[PDB]
Design a protein around this motif. Structure first.
Motif, PDB file in Angstrom:
ATOM      1  N   UNK A   1       0.840  -1.189   0.000  1.00  0.00           N
ATOM      2  CA  UNK A   1       0.000   0.000   0.000  1.00  0.00           C
ATOM      3  C   UNK A   1       0.882   1.248   0.000  1.00  0.00           C
ATOM      4  N   UNK A   2       0.608   2.145  -0.957  1.00  0.00           N
ATOM      5  CA  UNK A   2       1.352   3.381  -1.133  1.00  0.00           C
ATOM      6  C   UNK A   2       0.807   4.442  -0.182  1.00  0.00           C
ATOM      7  N   UNK A   3       1.723   5.102   0.541  1.00  0.00           N
ATOM      8  CA  UNK A   3       1.383   6.110   1.536  1.00  0.00           C
ATOM      9  C   UNK A   3       2.381   7.266   1.487  1.00  0.00           C
ATOM     10  N   UNK A   4       1.963   8.407   2.052  1.00  0.00           N
ATOM     11  CA  UNK A   4       2.838   9.536   2.333  1.00  0.00           C
ATOM     12  C   UNK A   4       2.831   9.761   3.844  1.00  0.00           C
ATOM     13  N   UNK A   5       4.028   9.830   4.434  1.00  0.00           N
ATOM     14  CA  UNK A   5       4.180   9.989   5.870  1.00  0.00           C
ATOM     15  C   UNK A   5       4.105  11.469   6.240  1.00  0.00           C
ATOM     16  N   UNK A   6       3.423  11.747   7.360  1.00  0.00           N
ATOM     17  CA  UNK A   6       3.271  13.093   7.899  1.00  0.00           C
ATOM     18  C   UNK A   6       4.243  13.318   9.058  1.00  0.00           C
ATOM     19  N   UNK A   7       4.880  12.232   9.520  1.00  0.00           N
ATOM     20  CA  UNK A   7       5.760  12.259  10.680  1.00  0.00           C
ATOM     21  C   UNK A   7       6.990  11.389  10.437  1.00  0.00           C
ATOM     22  N   UNK A   8       8.027  11.628  11.251  1.00  0.00           N
ATOM     23  CA  UNK A   8       9.281  10.891  11.211  1.00  0.00           C
ATOM     24  C   UNK A   8       9.133   9.578  11.979  1.00  0.00           C
TER      25      UNK A   8
ATOM     26  N   UNK B   1       7.302   9.132  -0.079  1.00  0.00           N
ATOM     27  CA  UNK B   1       6.361   8.226  -0.720  1.00  0.00           C
ATOM     28  C   UNK B   1       6.826   6.788  -0.490  1.00  0.00           C
ATOM     29  N   UNK B   2       6.043   6.043   0.303  1.00  0.00           N
ATOM     30  CA  UNK B   2       6.451   4.741   0.813  1.00  0.00           C
ATOM     31  C   UNK B   2       5.402   3.683   0.478  1.00  0.00           C
ATOM     32  N   UNK B   3       5.891   2.511   0.054  1.00  0.00           N
ATOM     33  CA  UNK B   3       5.070   1.328  -0.143  1.00  0.00           C
ATOM     34  C   UNK B   3       5.258   0.382   1.039  1.00  0.00           C
ATOM     35  N   UNK B   4       4.170   0.173   1.788  1.00  0.00           N
ATOM     36  CA  UNK B   4       4.185  -0.640   2.996  1.00  0.00           C
ATOM     37  C   UNK B   4       3.022  -1.633   2.953  1.00  0.00           C
ATOM     38  N   UNK B   5       3.147  -2.717   3.733  1.00  0.00           N
ATOM     39  CA  UNK B   5       2.150  -3.774   3.838  1.00  0.00           C
ATOM     40  C   UNK B   5       0.836  -3.196   4.353  1.00  0.00           C
ATOM     41  N   UNK B   6      -0.278  -3.787   3.892  1.00  0.00           N
ATOM     42  CA  UNK B   6      -1.633  -3.376   4.236  1.00  0.00           C
ATOM     43  C   UNK B   6      -1.846  -3.426   5.748  1.00  0.00           C
ATOM     44  N   UNK B   7      -1.173  -4.380   6.410  1.00  0.00           N
ATOM     45  CA  UNK B   7      -1.222  -4.573   7.852  1.00  0.00           C
ATOM     46  C   UNK B   7      -0.768  -3.309   8.580  1.00  0.00           C
TER      47      UNK B   7
END
Ligand SMILES: [Mg+2]
Ligand SMILES: [Mg+2]
Ligand SMILES: [Mg+2]
Ligand SMILES: [Mg+2]
Lengths: 123, 95, 243, 154, 76
Positions: free
Chosen positions: B42-49, B59-65
């Motif tokens: 799942x593709x996401x954008x992080x708002x925090x460190x 822009x990060x691809x991480x597991x749905x979990x």
RNA sequence: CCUCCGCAUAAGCCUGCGUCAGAUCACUGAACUGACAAUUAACAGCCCAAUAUCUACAAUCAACCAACAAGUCAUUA
RNA sequence: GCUAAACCUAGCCCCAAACCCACUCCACCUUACUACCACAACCUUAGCCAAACCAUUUACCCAAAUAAAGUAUAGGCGAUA
């Protein structure tokens, strides 16, 4: 083994024969040791007038002339009760669209002893 | 989900007709179970460190979990939608 | 004898004379429309025509949906359209074997969601499909607002939708009374879904519910005839005075 | 007495006349029974009919007055409150209300009643309708047929 | 070991209709037509008080509410 | 001359040998048809304001004795 | 010469046309037809039968008559669809 006859208080065992009745309206309640308490107020009171010096009798003379049948409606009742008062008061400045209760109208039936809807009196 | 196909062919109906079905048409054959197909990111954008995933504006691809259970609930990350993606490019360009 | 209208039309025909007649136009149109749900349990045929490998002749194809059963528990959650499939199978994928009754049930998960417009935390029973659709729509609100009635397959889904649409319509200040600018942001994010208030009243309503709502609106204490006659009498008197 | 005659009569006077008619009725009713017992003809049996009619008339006259006044005051056509309801047999009934001490949600006996039809009833409603139609169709035919024979004879 | 088995006790009332949760709107209930139907939502009724006193149908105060109630226990 | 039946309650039935008039194994009548009567509450049915709170010790002539399968019956604020 | 016999009209059937009744007062979901007190509905039809047995299989209303056509196609490639 009968279905067709009308079911009556005559018909069951002991308990059944106690429970059902004829149509009579109950006039009290029961308390401990099956003592029946009658309430005087639950009993209907016959409001029966004085008949002395009364000219009307149960039959009518045939000598009386015939007249056309016309039933009563709200329209004509208003015309021969409220309407003359309204128009008379329209001639002067006494009449008012507000507080027309003076002419006999009521906003609510709640306070009344004889409430028209729902009816709260017998006949 | 489970995907099935019929054993028996159904006769054509035409354009404005609903197809006529039979007791035989109720027999199915299992095509695939969707739950058994391999995992996707799942593709996401992080708002925090956030630890060991990246920093703000990445822009990060991480597991749905991890995404649905840690990142999204706490507001650590946001959906990589086209609408908010451009917004994160904008704040970067202000430097 | 014969009935005048085929029996299958009666449902439609009854909508025209009673309380259903005086229901709003937009609601009746939303009731009438008969559009198909998106495939959930069957791979659709890509094209309108396909060549037969048997004879090498190009032949028309149609997409025939599998019938889906939805248990009443499904109304209290958000299943992406997954239902119970009740069917038959052959024993070892050979037609010459015994025929048997099969039911395929979807896997269910209790999950937590936050609605931005409603500013409310919910806990609902969902499937993986639903979670996937939410991800693709980029939020619960978007999922609820974008998805039509058919695909949602949930009374509760529709109720969520009704609330959100009502909130957008009314520009409700109680979303964030303490923080007005955040309220402005949340509104302009979901501005494309916004519809009129009086139309938003009736979204996601069953006919029974609808007819209760309509009956409640039309029901009134009847006017005393004293007022009617007094109004008209002063009118006759008004015209009499102006002579 | 005619209804017209009684309408001219006063409100209080109607009430008085009504007891005059009451006593008269009872006399004639006891007289009916005594003839029946003695196995003899009644003297003037038609009197009873007249008396009954008079009181019917009186009741109607009074009823009219009450009804009129209700319209003017509340605009209610029916004295007793009620509702259109749907019984379990799926048919539409005018349910008359009764009086209770407690509010409806607290009434155990009242809540036992089902004022709605479950789906299984719909097919029966169909059959019922169909039946009604048949009877009607039969009636119509016979009307026509009868006219036909009446044309050949005349 | 607690006394009174689960089956004998008054049943826990069924969970509330989900429509009630949603803050935007008020549910459509069968309050309007004065009887139960299965398809509309269950109304929540305000607690009822008989305005007048009736001896036969009388409910006593809670025990703290009685005038003669005392913390110190007398033995009779 | 006979009586292991009777009288009552319950349970069941619903006017099913009271009176009067015609009418038809047996009366030209009745357990037939029609009309008219009747079964009166003290017996019996139909009950009970609330919240806490109380209720260890059989029955059997209940005494002595004797058990086992361990028992139909109470309140107070 | 008894027992009898004889009868024409109640009505009904199939069509067409047309979308139907839900009803003075009182009572009636408790033991219905009884004036008067703190749970809830949605969930694959099966089988006879045909196959000269039987076991996969065996027409059943879905919204324009005719024709395309018993064609393409399906099927213990067989009955049949
Ligand atoms: Mg065609
Ligand atoms: Mg006694
Ligand atoms: Mg065979
Ligand atoms: Mg054969």
């Amino acid at each position: 083994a009968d279905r067709m006859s009308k079911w009556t208080s005559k018909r069951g065992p002991r308990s059944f024969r106690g429970r059902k009745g004829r149509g009579a309206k109950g006039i009290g309640f029961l308390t401990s040791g099956w003592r029946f308490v009658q309430i005087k107020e639950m009993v209907p009171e016959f409001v029966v007038p004085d008949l002395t010096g009364f000219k009307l009798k149960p039959y009518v003379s045939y000598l009386a002339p015939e007249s056309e049948e016309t039933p009563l409606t709200a329209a004509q009742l208003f015309s021969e009760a409220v309407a003359p008062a309204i128009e008379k008061d329209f001639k002067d400045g006494t009449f008012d669209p507000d507080n027309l209760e003076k002419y006999g109208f009521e906003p609510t039936q709640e306070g009344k002893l004889f409430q028209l809807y729902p009816r709260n009196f017998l006949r | 989900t489970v995907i099935v196909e019929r054993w028996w062919k159904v006769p054509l109906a035409g354009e404005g007709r609903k197809p006529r079905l039979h007791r035989r048409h109720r027999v199915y054959k299992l095509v695939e179970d969707t739950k058994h197909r391999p995992k996707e990111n799942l593709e996401l954008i992080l708002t925090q460190s956030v630890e060991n995933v990246g920093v703000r504006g990445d822009l990060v691809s991480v597991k749905k979990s991890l995404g649905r259970n840690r990142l999204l609930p706490q507001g650590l990350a946001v959906y990589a939608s086209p609408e908010n993606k451009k917004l994160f490019e904008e704040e970067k360009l202000l430097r | 004898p014969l009935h005048k209208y085929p029996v299958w039309l009666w449902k439609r025909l009854q909508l025209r004379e009673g309380i259903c007649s005086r229901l709003p136009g937009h609601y009746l149109r939303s009731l009438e429309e008969e559009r198909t749900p998106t495939p959930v349990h069957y791979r659709p045929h890509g094209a309108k025509f396909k060549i037969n490998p048997k004879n090498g002749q190009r032949e028309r194809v149609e997409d025939v949906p599998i019938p889906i059963y939805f248990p009443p528990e499904s109304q209290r959650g958000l299943w992406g359209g997954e239902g119970w499939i009740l069917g038959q199978i052959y024993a070892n994928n050979d037609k010459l074997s015994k025929r048997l009754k099969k039911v395929w049930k979807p896997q269910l998960f209790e999950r937590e969601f936050y609605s931005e417009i409603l500013d409310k935390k919910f806990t609902v029973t969902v499937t993986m499909r639903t979670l996937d659709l939410i991800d693709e729509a980029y939020g619960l609100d978007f999922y609820i607002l974008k998805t039509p009635k058919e695909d949602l397959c949930s009374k509760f889904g529709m109720d969520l939708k009704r609330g959100m649409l009502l909130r957008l319509a009314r520009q409700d200040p109680q979303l964030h009374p303490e923080d007005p600018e955040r309220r402005a942001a949340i509104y302009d994010k979901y501005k494309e879904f916004a519809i009129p208030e009086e139309e938003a009243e009736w979204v996601g309503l069953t006919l029974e519910e609808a007819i209760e709502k309509q009956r409640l609106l039309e029901e009134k204490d009847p006017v005393p005839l004293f007022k009617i006659y007094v109004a008209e009498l002063i009118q006759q008197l008004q015209q009499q005075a102006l002579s | 007495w005619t209804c017209q005659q009684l309408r001219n009569k006063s409100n209080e006077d109607l009430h008085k006349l009504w007891y005059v008619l009451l006593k008269e009725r009872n006399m004639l009713l006891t007289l009916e029974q005594e003839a029946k017992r003695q196995r003899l003809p009644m003297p003037s049996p038609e009197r009873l009919d007249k008396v009954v009619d008079s009181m019917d008339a009186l009741d109607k006259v009074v009823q009219e007055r009450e009804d009129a006044l209700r319209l003017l005051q509340t605009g209610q056509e029916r004295a007793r409150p009620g509702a259109w309801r749907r019984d379990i047999f799926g048919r539409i009934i005018w349910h008359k209300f009764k009086q209770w001490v407690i509010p409806w949600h607290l009434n155990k006996r009242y809540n036992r009643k089902r004022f709605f039809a479950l789906p299984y009833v719909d097919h029966f409603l169909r059959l019922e309708r169909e039946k009604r139609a048949r009877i009607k169709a039969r009636k119509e035919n016979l009307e026509r047929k009868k006219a036909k024979i009446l044309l050949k004879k005349f | 070991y607690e006394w009174g088995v689960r089956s004998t006790r008054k049943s826990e009332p069924p969970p509330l209709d989900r429509v009630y949760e949603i803050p935007g709107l008020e549910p459509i209930t069968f309050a309007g037509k004065m009887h139960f139907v299965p398809w509309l939502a269950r109304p929540i009724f305000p607690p009822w008080d008989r305005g007048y006193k009736d001896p036969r149908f009388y409910r006593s105060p809670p025990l703290h509410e009685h005038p003669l109630y005392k913390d110190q226990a007398c033995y009779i």
